[PDB]
Design a protein around this ligand. Structure first.
Ligand SMILES: *[C@@H](C)[C@H]1/C(=C/c2[nH]c(/C=C3N=C(/C=C4\NC(=O)C(CC)=C4C)C(C)=C\3CCC(=O)O)c(CCC(=O)O)c2C)NC(=O)[C@@H]1C
Length: 172
């Protein structure tokens, strides 16, 4: 798996031309590891070999990803913010869209990205069937808008991997 994702992570970056994109897996114990990583020359540092905990992600945010599969983080400069609210229900209903074409990230996240000096970020969760095995994330030093058309082509490119991460689970 480690080897296969090393070649895949490189292929995406070359296409998305993003300075940094890597694969993130999740361990039931809460620990997460980056087993693959493509870097743009050397503007941003290498995070490979470093274990990141799931704490990085809460829950509600993941819901929309599991609900609307668009997966996009807007310019940390535009200052768009997401937030929690009193008890609520009917989310499982799976209502078509029903929300903006973006997923604002709470300030706590704003710094998280900015602290890394990244103005924008593209994501594409790696899931097999009904399960999520990891998280795809791209980072670059620029607050630029993304196109839905080009996004899909890659969205599919990630689907392929979904097969590799899955097909790999059996062999391994
Ligand atoms: C702050 C109080 C809370 C928080 C907010 C928050 N962040 C996310 C989710 C993400 N976390 C990542 C993780 C990564 N960056 C890396 O370097 C790595 C390698 C291990 C990863 C995979 C990022 C960039 C995301 C975006 C993906 C996603 O949407 O799940 C969000 C989502 C934004 C939104 O509101 O739509 C939230 C809510 N971070 C915390 O740890 C607190 C729970």
């Amino acid at each position: 798996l480690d080897q296969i994702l090393r070649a895949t992570v490189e292929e995406v970056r070359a296409f998305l031309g993003t300075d940094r994109v890597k694969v993130y897996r999740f361990d039931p114990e809460g620990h997460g590891t980056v087993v693959a990583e493509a870097r743009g020359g050397e503007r941003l540092p290498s995070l490979l070999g470093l274990t990141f905990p799931a704490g990085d992600i809460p829950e509600e945010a993941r819901r929309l990803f599991r609900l609307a599969q668009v997966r996009v983080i807007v310019d940390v400069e535009a200052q768009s913010r997401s937030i929690s609210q009193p008890e609520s229900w009917g989310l499982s209903a799976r209502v078509p869209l029903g929300e903006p074409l973006q997923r604002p990230v709470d300030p706590c996240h704003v710094h998280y990205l900015k602290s890394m000096g990244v103005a924008s970020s593209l994501v594409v969760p790696l899931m097999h069937h009904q399960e999520l095995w990891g998280l795809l994330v791209s980072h670059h030093a620029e607050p630029r808008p993304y196109s839905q058309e080009e996004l899909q082509v890659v969205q599919l490119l990630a689907d392929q991997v979904s097969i590799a991460i899955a097909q790999a689970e059996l062999s391994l």
